[PDB]
Amino acid sequence: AQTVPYGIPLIKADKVQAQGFKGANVKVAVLDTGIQASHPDLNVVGGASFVAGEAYNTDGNGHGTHVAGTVAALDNTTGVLGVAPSVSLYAVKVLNSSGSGSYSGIVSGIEWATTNGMDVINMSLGGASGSTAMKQAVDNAYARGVVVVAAAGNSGNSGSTNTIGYPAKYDSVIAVGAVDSNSNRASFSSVGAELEVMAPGAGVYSTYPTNTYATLNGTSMASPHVAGAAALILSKHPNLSASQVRNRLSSTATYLGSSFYYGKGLINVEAAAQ
Ligand SMILES: [Ca+2]
């Protein structure tokens, strides 16, 4: 009855879980298209919306629901399993139904998360340009003790071209690139100097609008795996800081090749978790 996406085992999230660490008491904010809060495999505890005319608890685009799924689909007898199923989930709608949003809605969501005490911020979501405001929000949030994770981008590689997007490019933010179930880098992952870690991003099965499950591809799918991994670590060592959580993830990642295409490699929550 319950399915275990290949992604959880690959990052060895299952092993931290077996020890009894599942992100209990860790507050994760998912900055996306919202979340079908009525899905039976999810438990959204709150949030807000920065998008005109849409609450935060409806998702007219499946995207935000799928990502919310990778972090926290409940541990039960139905649907899927999230990396940190006992997390406190907040849906912050910063993107519209068609998948786009303004810097201003985006910076609003960041600020709401910092302010409301969120421990992790997932932004599956990129842009070719940053702003001064954005950099400020992210830096500040990070400085204020929040672990900020973002999708690196789906721009592939072209020679020695850096293709990493905003906000992943900011050094206070963890840029996540994508691998498949054979730990091979996916073609769509952005490349560049700022790439930090890899997570499963190809053929990820998760929660999808109207009480169902679907498979999606993208760096967007990769990022929540890392947000989840952060929450696992924190439930084990609640004393750790954002930079300490960050160093654990990158310094214990499985080496896959050149940093340009892979960062420090594929995350290993068991080694990271200590
Ligand atoms: Ca489930």
All structural domains of the chain with their residue ranges: 1-274
Catalytically annotated residue among 49, 220, 223, 235: 220
Query: Within 13 Å and on the Cβ side, how many CA atoms surround 239?
Result: 2
Q: Is residue 2 part of an annotated ligand binding site?
A: yes
- Pick the closest to residue 71 from 184, 234, 244, 274 (CA basis): 234
Q: Is residue 125 part of an annotated ligand binding site?
A: no
Query: How far is residue 61's CA from residue 13's CA, in Å, rounded to a whole number?
Result: 27
- DSSP-based three-state secondary structure for 141: helix
Pairing mode, strands 174-179 and 204-208: unpaired
Catalytically annotated residue among 39, 63, 66, 225: 63
Give distance in angstroms: CA of 148 to centre of ligand 1: 26
Query: How far is residue 139's CA from residue 108's CA, in Å, rounded to a whole number?
Result: 14
Examine the residue annotation and report whether 187 is marked as an active-site residue of this protein: no
List strands edge to edge, sheet with 27-32. Answer: 44-49, 88-93, 27-32, 120-123, 147-151, 174-179, 197-200
Give distance in angstroms: CA of 103 to centre of ligand 1: 34
Examine the residue annotation and report whether 235 is marked as an active-site residue of this protein: no
CATH number of 1-274: 3.40.50.200
30 bridge partner residues: 91, 122
Catalytically annotated residue among 32, 124, 155, 172: 32
Query: How far is residue 204's CA from residue 220's CA, in Å, rounded to a whole number?
Result: 10
Q: Is residue 80 part of an annotated ligand binding site?
A: yes
243 contact partners, CB below 8 Å, separation of at least 6: none
Q: Is residue 170 part of an annotated ligand binding site?
A: yes
- Pick the closest to residue 119 from 255, 238, 271, 8 (CA basis): 238
- Resolution given for this structure, in angstroms: 2.3
Give distance in angstroms: CA of 76 to centre of ligand 1: 5
Q: Is residue 269 part of an annotated ligand binding site?
A: no
Examine the residue annotation and report whether 39 is marked as an active-site residue of this protein: no
- Token output for 91: 């849906």
- Name the experiment that determined this structure: X-ray
Cα 25 → chain centroid = 18
SS (H, E, C) 14-31: HHHHHCCCCCCCCEEEEE
**How many Å is the Cα radius of gyration of the chain?**
16
- Amino acid residing at 186: A
Burial of 20 (0-12, 13-18, 19+ CB in 10 A): exposed
Give distance in angstroms: CA of 212 to centre of ligand 1: 11
Cα 9 → chain centroid = 17
| Torsion angles phi and psi, residue 254, rounded to 5 | -80, 120
